[PDB]
Design a protein around this ligand. Structure first.
Ligand SMILES: CCCCCCCCCCCCCCCCCC(=O)OC[C@H](COP(=O)([O-])OCC(O)COP(=O)([O-])OC[C@@H](COC(=O)CCCCCCCCCCCCCCCCC)OC(=O)CCCCCCCCCCCCCCCCC)OC(=O)CCCCCCCCCCCCCCCCC
Ligand SMILES: CCCCCCCCCCCCCCCCCC(=O)O[C@@H](COC(=O)CCCCCCCCCCCCCCC)COP(=O)(O)OCC[N+](C)(C)C
Ligand SMILES: CCCCCCCCCCCCCCCCCC(=O)O[C@@H](COC(=O)CCCCCCCCCCCCCCC)COP(=O)(O)OCC[N+](C)(C)C
Ligand SMILES: CCCCCCCCCCCCCCCCCC(=O)O[C@@H](COC(=O)CCCCCCCCCCCCCCC)COP(=O)(O)OCC[N+](C)(C)C
Ligand SMILES: CCCCCCCCCCCCCCCCCCCC(=O)O[C@H](COC(=O)CCCCCCCCCCCCCC)COP(=O)(O)OCCN
Ligand SMILES: CCCCCCCCCCCCCCCCCCCC(=O)O[C@H](COC(=O)CCCCCCCCCCCCCC)COP(=O)(O)OCCN
Ligand SMILES: CCCCCCCCCCCCCCCCCCCC(=O)O[C@H](COC(=O)CCCCCCCCCCCCCC)COP(=O)(O)OCCN
Ligand SMILES: CCCCCCCCCCCCCCCCCCCC(=O)O[C@H](COC(=O)CCCCCCCCCCCCCC)COP(=O)(O)OCCN
Lengths: 155, 438, 51, 127, 77, 536, 97, 111
């Protein structure tokens, strides 16, 4: 994938047209975009208008993800408090969804040095599954535990 | 924004025209009016404008001023703590020096131009050289230390700013630029390394705090240490992220070493102001490392913990200054029986010392939890290292409290009405932030 | 970024590359290349000769 | 009388102070104390650290003798005369999930090996 | 001005004299002993570090041995 | 209704500690006990609703106590069956101690501040117990830590008291650092701080070790027990609260709330702590210190029982709540004995005319400690001993611990009552008012109700054991009691000296750990920053 | 030494104060003096009790508004008298009450 | 021999000529001790007694440099583990000599 200078300048011109279209009508939610500006730039910093707009879009998405995770946690707590000693069976699905939301919210913008957030021990469980498969097929002895059906309340 | 900048320029302006007998009253009114203008700036700052709440330019790239999350918190903190400094300080000379220092520092926080940031921040170089080296109660050695350290670090930062202005053509933050050069990254980094006291460039801060006046110490601890994080979020992380991720093991080495050795050096202190000053150095490392992770948690946690420090350490410095006025001593060994002799001072001292030990009902707890969570997001061992060696702070804080608490004393040294008026706002702010209104 | 939610800085794609484009149409250099004497002195092949 | 009791005041310093005098804690009452009792000065009971180490050397083998037999010498089949509590399959499968469970030692079960490897789990998270 | 250096002897008969002094030299641990005890206690403090190191080495060695056996199986086959 | 008790305790704390000038010493002597009585009614209602009638309630005071990115925690209270039981026990004991302090602390200058500390101390215990998430528990944990620091060091003109408070603070700091590490682990890999989503069937060992290391701090186990013995410097009402419910039990409550512990570690540590505590209590000559070492031994029993069976958590909690009662009674009666005799040493106590109520309360509490049959302590201790038979190593050590416990309990009883008078011929007296009688009546009512209501659901469930195995603890306790009455010598003078020094755990810290700590400080400061890096 | 003029404004030694114990009467502490017993203490205690009960009423309203029972109690509970959000009791067998 | 300096009414005047010593803020000042002052002076100016000895070099190296070396090694190990965890290629850290240019992960890319 290679970008010639002509294509780069053409995309620059088109982004200027986008900025002019946005400027025409006032919008109080200008910095809370619902859609990104699609691009194939090597670095988004090359075009400043795309950079800031998509950064605002990412911020909006992350705020939505945080509030969604709080919602999922609320229904998980309610479902836990309702069933009683049947919680482990009946709250498996809601916990699954809540942990999925947590991983989405954390992992999308973890950062340059941050590690992936293993809510529910899914990646470890997958690693153990792969290790056990390889050890059994190759005749080796695995020094690690086999994969578990359930390691947390959901995942 | 414009009102805040105008009031910041108005405060030094008023001193030239005041009667020289109305100076204290006019300065206090001006400080409160600047606080109100900062509240207005917060009111006119809409969260819908996610990148920058407000940007104003007055005809040039240098005159570009703007507020973001970090800038707004730090500016409100300085505007909050300045009036206490104003009442603590007497004399037209001292008022002039402190007003000029505050104007320069508060203009630095909202600046969006690295060169203008450098110009405003270092304008307060001689003012501290004169302030810390004042006639009877100042030391020339400490003033030399602080001035030379600041000059070398700021000159390195200036060289990096010149290279950026030559290459990109601009040095304003609002224009997106990225660099992978390590020389420029170090040039920007060295200022942060020195200004945020980080071992082994932390030697200037202690000597400065001990030999600075109480208002000077309050400003130094409250906001001048926080200027490092404004520079990091505004002028280093946007452009120098590749270098911070390349050097992260080294960054952790230096930060955790600063934490540990500053904690151990605190144990060898006999002077109360030195104890508080070394506690500040140990506290800065968590902030620096949490920001350096370049994650959403780290930046927020660092700015929060800066606010917590800028509400707790000024209170300790103010209480120590009050005690020194009452007793003419700062040696812990001379001071005994303070619990019986000064119950009202002792209550606030214990409250603020608990705040410095990061107990739950204090803002330091919430801030530390967020910062440790960011460190745990990077790695478990990173958080574990900081959590364990926090016990060293407990040892020296407990030893100091035990030494002061009991004994035989023949002097009633308790605070007056003026002193209680001085710390009431800090106590109220500490409580309000502690219950979660961070 | 200047916000507390997403990381500062940015990232560049490693797959995508940008074709080099010349800074100017015609390049005139006023910096002279190293002399043969400089290359001779810098040569460390024979340690005695280098010394 | 709890309040108002006579006390002795520690004499004022009259000689050059040692550099590490911060190791001494004196509030003004006569019996000043080290920062940590036993760091220096009189020892409680005139017992040194060597004496305490020798006493512990005598005790540890006797104290550890009950624990070492069951944990190391004994094995799951011979530890107890009975098997772990028997549960219905639906209950047993859930209970066997717990790494800190007590049904993982059921050698009658056909999943004994996997249960034992589950019990000896991971030291640290892999991710 | 300065506090008096003369002590009070009113309570000596009740609570004993102050003649007896401390035998401590007010000196610290020797450098050799300090080296041993730092390099013993600090590892005990950092017990998670060694646990993580042990498990990571175990994981990497098992992965490499699996890779080697995989290479052997994929060479002949 | 559920919130009311914490409100009453914190109101007592604020009123007595900030407006005590207006209220006065009498004003504290009314507002304290009245508020805790009202809190006792509220706690009784909570206990009936949650435990007996199985109705758990969640109260969310406010949301987003900490809201930074994904990290989100709320101030919520969940009263589950464990929380209601601990709340009832704590409020009952604290009301008793507040009744006790009206007469005991009258000769103390700051009685209002003492009452305020006691009430905030109880309030933070209830915050710890009723928290629905880990952060509320940490808040209560640190609150009880700081309140213990302000209560042990109440006598500031005593170097020993302030150093004891510093010891408690530092040890507890290390413990909660380990707990904070475990909290961060659990938030990262489970997605929440709430106990409901906290559940993990498999947890890596590091989290378990961190949880255990944090728990062994407040629940003083081995290598972390140094502070409990020194905690005797504080006033007697403080000792009763800290040893009975607030501080020591918190680690056990945390281990029971989250079953992330490992069987191998807990059983060995608990059995070792029980044996060592009994052996240390053998040598002690202060009345108050023996009871603290007995507290250590009982904590060892409770920690050991977790390894035995699935019902171990229930058995530990039952012994916890049973132990709070007779231990609090033992401290309160010991404190009254010290006041009446102006003495702390067991040698000089002796038979003397006194109140029938206090002597009976001491006798019944000591009988519960010993294991006397058909008593609340007896059932809660046989539930542990009989169920520990499967763990052969644990069972043996606990049986020897029962022998030692019987011996020193009977020795203390003989020295306090049966022995001839040992104190001097001086006018000494402490006349007890009706308030202290109401205090001991409340403790005795707790003890009596414990027999009828029980401690655990599986308390009387059969452990299928041979009769000679099942009734063995009684014989060991009886032999220990008979040997204690005769005041025979059990160990040689060398081992008696070793136990008097409490195993030399503190002397090791002094000679090696503290010296290394201050040599690290010397290298950091004197050699480096004020040395190498300081100009001439 | 002749007592200073302000000693008249300072209060006396209380009945609970031991006669031998001396304290400086000029020191002010929010928790009270060394032995207190102020004049008018009864009215202050009555006012404190009134404030306590009023705050209890407010806390009771707040808690009742925020008390959530999501699982039916096994039997009748006292909260049914004052809060209407209690689910109808169901016993161990499962029968509704 | 003493008099009250402060006046709440506002009619405060400093009696510099008064025979009686005013009860001003200096009334409560701590008396101070000669040897304590010299101990304070000695402790602050401890750089005067600094001497380079092999024991001093040994202590400084073993504790300070040792802790720096240990922290750097631990941080490098954690970075290596995180790179394996995240699935990133081995990152080009400053003192690590790696023939890969991977420094900052691309957000757009799936690793
Ligand atoms: C970590 C390991 C443990 C560290 C200690 C281990 C032993 C250290 C061994 C070194 C040593 O013995 O130092 C003593 C020695 C001082 O002599 P002295 O016996 O104390 O007394 C002489 C003075 O009269 C003394 O009179 P004075 O009292 O008036 O002067 C005191 C002065 C004396 O101090 C100095 O003169 C130099 C101070 C900085 C030294 C630089 C690092 C040296 C050690 C690092 C490596 C050690 C590994 C071994 O101290 C200061 O006040 C200045 C300090 C303020 C700035 C602080 C900056 C700190 C930077 C690094 C700190 C050192 C690392 C420890 C903490 C690590 C934190 C990450 O220091 C040196 O000589 C420096 C040697 C290394 C210098 C770096 C290389 C210089 C580059 C020259 C390039 C040539 C250019 C060619 C062109 C020339 C034409 C222009
Ligand atoms: C010299 C001083 C003398 C005067 C002493 C003053 C005495 C102070 C009294 C102590 C106050 C204790 C109250 C603690 C609760 C905190 C109050 C609070 O935060 O208000 C909440 C409302 O919540 C409440 O009202 C709580 C009800 C308080 C009464 C409940 C029972 C009282 C028992 C105390 C237990 C509290 C433990 C909480 C631990 C964190 C605000 O609601 P939101 O709109 O959601 O605010 C957003 C949340 N956040 C603050 C984090 C930004
Ligand atoms: C959780 C929601 C509800 C919150 C209520 C908290 C309970 C009361 C909080 C009141 C404010 C807490 C901080 C008070 C100031 C801290 C200083 C202090 O507590 O005591 C002062 C002085 O006390 C006061 O004047 C004010 C205390 C009023 C009530 C204090 C209750 C206990 C404090 C609660 C602990 C704070 C929790 C922080 C960690 C979560 C000094 O005491 P001592 O050092 O022991 O010396 C006293 C003299 N003597 C030697 C004779 C003992
Ligand atoms: C191996 C450790 C495993 C268990 C760790 C838990 C305990 C660790 C050491 C506990 C020290 C805390 C005790 C303390 O506060 O010490 C002094 C407080 O004084 C001090 O400040 C000394 C500092 C000691 C604290 C730190 C030293 C131990 C550090 C452990 C490791 C050192 C380096 C590790 C890496 C930093 C008070 O003691 P006492 O004099 O006996 O007072 C008791 C009351 N009575 C007078 C009646 C006897
Ligand atoms: C291609 C070039 C190759 C390299 C060549 C290197 C040649 C040497 C370069 C050194 C440049 C550093 C300049 C600072 C010199 C130290 C300060 C002078 C020492 C001194 O005596 O100053 C006294 C007080 O200063 C103080 O109290 C300050 C204490 C020390 C200040 C700390 C230094 C700043 C931090 C150092 C590193 C910072 C980061 C570096 C990237 C005042 O003396 P006086 O006024 O009474 O005059 C009387 C004359 N005796
Ligand atoms: C020894 C431990 C290191 C101490 C630093 C501790 C942590 C500081 C990290 C700050 C984070 C951003 C700074 C960027 C890099 C600074 C130092 C990184 C470590 C380093 O020296 O790497 C070198 C590369 O950097 C360079 O080539 C330049 C180094 C910095 C230059 C020093 C002074 C520059 C002043 C310039 C003023 C402004 C000029 C602006 C034009 C050589 O590593 P390598 O990649 O060659 O690997 C070869 C190994 N086998
Ligand atoms: C039931 C579960 C276990 C409970 C705790 C058991 C602890 C057992 C550890 C003691 C048993 C082995 C001791 C090592 C053998 C040494 C035998 C001779 C002792 C000796 O000659 O030197 C001593 C070294 O201190 C020492 O020996 C310190 C070594 C101790 C290792 C650290 C373990 C923690 C110990 C905490 C409690 C033990 C207290 C007694 C050690 C005294 O040294 P010195 O002062 O005369 O040196 C001179 C100052 N220049
Ligand atoms: C002149 C000044 C200097 C002179 C004096 C220096 C003497 C100090 C030398 C020893 C320092 C401690 C040992 C650390 C360095 C070990 C050798 C470095 C090589 C290395 O990285 O090996 C790793 C060491 O384990 C590790 O990752 C580190 C384990 C030790 C750290 C924990 C022990 C202390 C804990 C105290 C807290 C400090 C850390 C807080 C975070 C394991 O090899 P690898 O598998 O990683 O592969 C990496 C391929 N070489």
């Amino acid at each position: 994938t290679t970008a010639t200078i002509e294509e780069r300048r053409a995309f620059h011109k088109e982004v200027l047209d986008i900025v002019q279209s946005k400027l025409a009508n006032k919008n109080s939610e200008w910095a809370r975009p619902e859609e990104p500006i699609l691009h194939n730039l090597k670095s988004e910093k090359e075009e400043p208008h795309v950079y800031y707009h998509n950064n605002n879009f990412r911020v909006t998405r992350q705020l939505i993800h945080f509030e969604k995770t709080k919602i999922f946690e609320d229904e998980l707590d309610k479902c836990m408090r309702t069933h009683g000693e049947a919680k482990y069976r009946k709250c498996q699905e809601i916990a699954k969804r809540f942990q999925a939301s947590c991983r989405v919210a954390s992992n999308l913008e973890r950062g340059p040095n941050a590690r992936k957030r293993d809510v529910g021990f899914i990646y470890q469980n997958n690693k153990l599954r792969e290790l056990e498969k390889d050890a059994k097929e190759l005749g080796l002895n695995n020094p690690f535990p086999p994969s578990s059906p359930r390691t947390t309340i959901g995942y | 924004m414009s009102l805040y900048l105008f009031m910041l320029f108005l405060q030094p302006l008023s001193l030239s025209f005041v009667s020289r007998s109305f100076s204290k009253i006019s300065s206090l009114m001006m400080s409160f009016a600047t606080l109100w203008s900062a509240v207005y700036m917060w009111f006119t700052s809409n969260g819908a404008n996610q990148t920058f709440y407000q940007v104003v330019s007055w005809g040039s790239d240098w005159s570009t001023f703007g507020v973001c999350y970090t800038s707004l918190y730090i500016s409100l903190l300085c505007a909050f703590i300045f009036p206490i400094c104003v009442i603590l300080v007497q004399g037209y000379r001292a008022l002039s020096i402190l007003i000029c220092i505050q104007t320069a520092v508060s203009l630095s926080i909202v600046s969006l131009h690295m060169l203008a940031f450098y110009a405003l921040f270092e304008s307060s170089l001689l003012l501290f050289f004169i302030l810390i080296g004042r006639r009877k109660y100042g030391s020339l050695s400490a003033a030399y230390n602080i001035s030379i350290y600041t000059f070398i670090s700021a000159l390195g930062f200036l060289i990096s700013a010149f290279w950026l202005n030559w290459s990109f053509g601009s040095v304003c933050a609002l224009l997106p630029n990225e660099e992978a050069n390590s020389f420029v990254a170090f040039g920007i980094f060295i200022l942060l390394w020195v200004k945020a006291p980080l071992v082994p460039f932390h030697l200037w801060l202690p000597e400065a705090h001990v030999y600075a006046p109480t208002a000077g110490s309050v400003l130094l601890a409250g906001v001048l240490l926080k200027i490092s994080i404004v520079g990091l979020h505004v002028f280093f992380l946007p452009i120098c992220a590749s270098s911070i991720v390349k050097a992260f093991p080294l960054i952790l080495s230096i930060c955790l070493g600063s934490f540990i050795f500053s904690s151990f050096s605190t144990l060898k202190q006999i002077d109360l102001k030195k104890i508080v000053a070394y506690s500040s150095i140990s506290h800065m490392a968590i902030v620096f490392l949490s920001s350096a992770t370049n994650s959403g948690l780290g930046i927020q946690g660092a700015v929060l913990y800066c606010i917590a420090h800028g509400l707790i350490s000024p209170g300790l410095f103010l209480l120590v200054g009050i005690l020194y006025k009452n007793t003419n001593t700062k040696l812990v060994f001379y001071l005994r029986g303070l619990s019986q002799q000064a119950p009202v001072w002792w209550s606030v001292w214990v409250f603020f010392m608990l705040g410095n030990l990061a107990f739950p009902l204090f803002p330091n707890f919430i801030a530390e939890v967020v910062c440790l969570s960011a460190l745990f997001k990077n790695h478990e061992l990173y958080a574990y290292a900081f959590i364990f060696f926090s016990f060293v702070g407990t040892v020296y804080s407990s030893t100091v409290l035990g030494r002061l608490k009991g004994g035989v004393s023949s002097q009633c040294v308790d605070a007056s009405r003026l002193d209680v008026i001085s710390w009431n706002p800090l106590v109220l702010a500490t409580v309000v932030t502690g219950i979660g209104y961070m | 970024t200047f916000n507390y939610v997403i990381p500062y800085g940015g990232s560049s794609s490693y797959t995508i590359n940008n074709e080099p484009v010349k800074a100017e149409e015609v390049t005139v250099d006023f910096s002279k290349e190293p002399s043969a004497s400089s290359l001779k002195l810098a040569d460390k092949s024979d340690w005695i000769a280098y010394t | 009388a709890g309040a108002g009791g006579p006390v002795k005041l520690s004499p004022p310093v009259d000689k050059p102070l040692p550099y590490n005098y911060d190791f001494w804690m004196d509030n003004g009452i006569y019996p000043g104390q080290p920062i940590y009792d036993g760091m220096f000065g009189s020892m409680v009971g005139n017992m040194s650290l060597e004496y305490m180490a020798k006493g512990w050397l005598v005790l540890l083998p006797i104290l550890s003798a009950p624990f070492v037999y069951e944990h190391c010498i004994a094995d799951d089949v011979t530890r107890n005369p009975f098997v772990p509590r028997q549960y219905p399959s639906e209950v047993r499968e859930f209970l066997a999930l717990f790494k800190n469970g007590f049904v993982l030692n059921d050698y009658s079960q056909p999943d004994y090996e996997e249960m034992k490897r589950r019990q000896s789990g991971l030291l640290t998270p892999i991710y | 001005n300065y506090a008096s250096l003369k002590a009070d002897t009113s309570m000596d008969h009740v609570f004993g004299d102050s003649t007896n002094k401390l035998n401590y030299d007010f000196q610290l641990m020797s450098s050799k002993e300090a080296f041993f005890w730092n390099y013993t206690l600090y590892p005990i403090v950092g017990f998670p570090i060694f646990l993580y190191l042990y498990q990571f080495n175990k994981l990497e060695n098992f992965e490499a041995e699996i890779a080697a056996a995989k290479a052997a199986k994929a060479a002949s086959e | 209704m559920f919130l009311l008790a914490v409100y009453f305790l914190f109101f007592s704390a604020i009123a007595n500690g900030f407006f005590g000038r207006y209220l006065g010493v009498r004003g504290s002597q009314l507002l304290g006990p009245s508020a805790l009585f009202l809190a006792l009614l509220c706690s009784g209602t909570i206990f009936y609703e949650v435990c007996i009638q199985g109705c758990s309630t969640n109260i969310k005071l406010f949301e987003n106590f900490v809201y930074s990115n994904e990290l989100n925690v709320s101030a919520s209270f969940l009263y589950d069956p464990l929380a209601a039981t601990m709340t009832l026990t704590v409020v009952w004991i604290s009301c008793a101690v507040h009744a006790y302090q009206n007469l005991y602390m009258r000769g103390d200058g700051s009685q209002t501040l003492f009452t305020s500390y006691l009430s905030a101390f109880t309030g933070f215990m209830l915050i710890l117990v009723a928290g629905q998430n880990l952060v509320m528990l940490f808040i209560g944990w640190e609150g009880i830590g700081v309140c213990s620091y302000l209560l042990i060091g109440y006598y500031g003109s005593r170097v020993s008291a302030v150093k004891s408070a510093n010891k408690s603070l530092i040890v507890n700091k290390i413990s909660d650092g380990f707990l904070l590490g475990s909290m961060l682990y659990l938030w990262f890999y489970t997605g929440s701080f709430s106990y409901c989503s906290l559940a993990t069937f498999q947890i890596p060992d590091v989290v378990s070790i961190l949880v255990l290391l944090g728990a062994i701090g407040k629940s003083s186990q081995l290598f972390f027990h140094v502070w409990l013995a020194d905690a005797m410097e504080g006033p007697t009402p403080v000792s009763a609260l800290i040893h009975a419910a607030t501080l020591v039990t918190a680690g056990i409550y945390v281990l029971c709330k989250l079953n992330l512990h490992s069987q191998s570690a807990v059983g060995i540590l608990g059995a070792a702590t029980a044996l060592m505590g009994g052996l240390f209590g053998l040598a002690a000559n202060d009345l108050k210190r023996v009871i603290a070492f007995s507290t250590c031994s009982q904590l060892g029993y409770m920690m050991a029982v977790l390894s035995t069976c699935d019902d171990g958590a229930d058995f530990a909690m039952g012994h916890l709540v049973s132990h709070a009662g007779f231990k609090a009674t033992l401290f309160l009666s010991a404190g009254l004995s010290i006041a009446k005799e102006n003495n702390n040493f067991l040698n000089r106590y002796g038979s003397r005319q006194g109140s029938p109520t206090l002597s009976f309360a001491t006798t019944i509490a000591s009988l519960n400690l010993l294991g006397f049959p058909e008593l609340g302590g007896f059932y809660s201790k046989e539930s542990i001993l009989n169920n520990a038979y499967i763990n052969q190593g644990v069972s043996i050590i606990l049986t020897l611990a029962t022998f030692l416990t019987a011996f020193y309990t009977s020795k203390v009883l003989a020295q306090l009552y049966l022995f001839p008078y040992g104190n001097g011929r001086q006018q000494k007296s402490f006349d007890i008012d009706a308030t202290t009688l109401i205090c001991f009546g409340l403790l005795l009512s707790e003890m009596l109700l414990r027999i009828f209501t029980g401690s655990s659901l599986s308390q009387n469930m059969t452990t299928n054991l041979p009769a000679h195995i099942k009734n063995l603890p009684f014989w060991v306790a009886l032999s220990g009691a008979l040997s204690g009455l005769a005041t025979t010598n059990l160990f040689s003078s060398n081992f008696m000296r070793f136990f008097g020094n409490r195993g030399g755990f503190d002397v090791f810290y002094a000679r090696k750990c503290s010296n290394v700590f201050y040599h690290n400080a010397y290298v950091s400061y004197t050699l480096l920053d004020r040395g190498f890096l300081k100009l001439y | 030494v002749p007592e200073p003029p302000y000693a008249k404004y300072l209060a006396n030694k209380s009945h609970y104060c031991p006669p031998d114990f001396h304290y400086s009467r000029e020191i002010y502490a929010p928790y009270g003096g060394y032995f207190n017993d102020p004049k008018g203490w009864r009215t202050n205690t009555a006012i404190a009790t009134l404030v306590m009960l009023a705050g209890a009423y407010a806390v009771f309203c707040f808690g009742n508004a925020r008390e959530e029972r999501l699982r039916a109690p096994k039997g009748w509970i006292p909260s049914q008298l004052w809060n209407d959000n209690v689910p109808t009791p169901v016993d161990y067998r499962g029968k509704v009450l | 021999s003493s008099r009250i300096a402060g006046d709440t009414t506002g009619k405060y005047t400093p009696n510099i000529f008064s025979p009686e010593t005013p009860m001003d803020r200096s009334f409560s000042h701590v008396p101070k001790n000669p040897f304590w002052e010299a101990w304070v002076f000695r402790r602050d100016n401890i750089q005067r007694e600094f001497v380079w000895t092999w024991q001093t070099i040994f202590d400084l190296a073993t504790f300070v440099g040792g802790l720096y070396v240990a922290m750097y090694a631990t941080a490098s190990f954690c970075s290596r583990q995180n790179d394996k965890r995240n699935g990133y290629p081995e990152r080009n850290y400053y003192f690590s000599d790696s023939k890969s240019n991977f420094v900052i992960p691309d957000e757009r890319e799936f690793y």
